[PDB]
Amino acid sequence: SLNTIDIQGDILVGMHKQKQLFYFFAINDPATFKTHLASDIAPVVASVTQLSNVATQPLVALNIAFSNTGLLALGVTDNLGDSLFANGQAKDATSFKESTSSWVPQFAGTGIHGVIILASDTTDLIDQQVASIESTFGSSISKLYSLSASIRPGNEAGHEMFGFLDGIAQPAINGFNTPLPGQNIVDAGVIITGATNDPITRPSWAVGGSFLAFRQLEQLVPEFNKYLLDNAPAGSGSLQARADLLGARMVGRWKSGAPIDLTPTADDPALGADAQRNNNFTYSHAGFDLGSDQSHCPFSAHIRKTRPRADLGGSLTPPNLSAGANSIMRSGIPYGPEVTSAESASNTTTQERGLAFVAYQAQLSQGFHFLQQTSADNANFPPGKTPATVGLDPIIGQNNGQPRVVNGLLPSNSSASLSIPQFVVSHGGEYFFSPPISAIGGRLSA
Ligand code: HEM
């Protein structure tokens, strides 16, 4: 019953283009905006069906999403069923132990009405599409802010700015995806509003959409690299190899993608590259106490925080299916320049770079907001551990600018604690609703 022809492609497939632009806009003269929304945008919005087929990847892939104030600007006063969306991300900031005082000023408010996501293999093609939009909409659309993003170059293609292969793990949608070994399998309504087993009643025109949580997350890459070298556990290999082990313990995967739960002391690049094997784990190991054993993967490791698997019950053998309702689909892409020679040499960031983080979910409170607040920022999550104080997620965990206490990272002693400065700095973002395609030229243009 999942009508993928009507679902925007970034939600379930991803744009998978070299370059992306996030174009954050305001609406003036809504009657004019609406005419062009229907005539100029709706026909070129890329669907899941379109992106699922090579023969039909468009030259420029385009998606569009609206904030609460953007829907209101279009005269849409309906309750979409999500209080977090309605209130906007700025009002949610304190839930994550940050302040909007640190944000890009355009995000610290509700002036942004929407985002157009443009993706293409060159920036020139994106620019041409933006020029076309500005030409036909005229002054009815106004750019408030934008952020350019790119797949990283060379041997870092598909890796985020710290160097780790990204985009490996996603929930499988039951009835749509063919699940990979170890992959969680969830009802479509966890991700798509109004789809199977979404318990929240939605406006009819909104069935087939998703909520988009956007975060501009700066990464302090030279600082991270230097921290790992300075805190590398003693051992037989090179200093860099031991630093790499510590980084892998923090993320829960080696940079190659190999999950540490399956290879806890050394990388396995072949495993990392193999989608049939690189997700096939639950954190359980026969003969080890799940509640205390951190020898395979720390309880505080990023991926263990964000998908706890057996830490939240369910099958000890793959696939673990726990906490399906707390799943998110991720379509983030790195932004900013590569690390420059001088920054690396000084172990100091000068230019801003990071992750243009994008999460899709049908309930913000169950997805992004939950994972940040209840897990990453919670020293006592996952529950039931010994010792009980897991500490914060070393990658994304926040405590109002203070160093984060993170336990279990050191293989030699699970009781050893590290106090870690932030390596990821929030510059804010917004919550949007990516409508079904039918609503774009339909209700939203009416
Ligand atoms: C700059 C910030 C971030 C970086 C560098 C980062 C990096 C990574 C990496 C390297 C992985 C493992 C690769 C993969 O499984 O695809 C991962 C997985 C994941 N991340 Fe993060 N991430 C960031 C922000 C976030 C945030 C803010 C959240 C949610 C609040 C989040 C949620 C997840 C989830 C759900 C997974 C998959 C877990 C699983 O299914 O096993 N990430 N991330």
Residue numbers in the entry: 3 to 448
What does the paper say about this structure?
Aromatic residues were changed to serine in the simple W377S, Y147S and Y337S variants (the latter with low refolding yield). Moreover, most of the variants show crystal structures largely superimposable with that of WT DyP, except for the mutated residues. The proof for Trp-377 being involved in the mixed protein radical was provided by the W377S variant. In the high-resolution narrow scan of its 9 GHz EPR spectrum (top), the tryptophanyl contribution observed for WT DyP completely disappeared (the spectrum of the W377S/Y147S variant, not shown, being nearly superimposable). The W377S spectrum (top) shows a single line with hyperfine resolution at g=2.0046(2). Simulation of this spectrum at X-band (bottom) confirmed that it corresponds to a tyrosine phenoxyl radical. As a main conclusion, Trp-377 appears responsible for the high-turnover catalytic site, since its substitution (W377S variant) completely prevented high-turnover oxidation of RB19 and DMP (and decreased over 40-fold the catalytic efficiency of high-turnover ABTS oxidation). Site-directed mutagenesis showed that high-turnover oxidation of RB19 and other substrates by DyP takes place at the same tryptophan residue (Trp-377), identified previously as forming a protein radical. Acidic pH optima were already reported for A. auricula-judae DyP, and are also typical of lignin-degrading peroxidases (LiP and VP). It is interesting that a delay period was not observed in oxidation reactions with WT DyP, and its W377S variant described below, which showed identical reaction traces and MALDI–TOF molecular masses with/without treatment with VA and H2O2.
DyPs (dye-decolorizing peroxidases) (EC 1.11.1.19) represent a new family of haem peroxidases widespread in bacteria, archaea, fungi and other micro-organisms. In the present study, we expressed A. auricula-judae DyP in E. coli, solved the crystal structure of the recombinant enzyme and several site-directed variants, and used PELE (Protein Energy Landscape Exploration) to describe the binding of its typical substrate RB19. The DyP structure is formed by two domains, each of them including an antiparallel four-stranded large β-sheet and two or three helices resulting in a ferredoxin-like fold (plus two additional β-strands). In spite of the obvious similarity between the two domains, only the C-terminal domain harbours a haem cofactor.
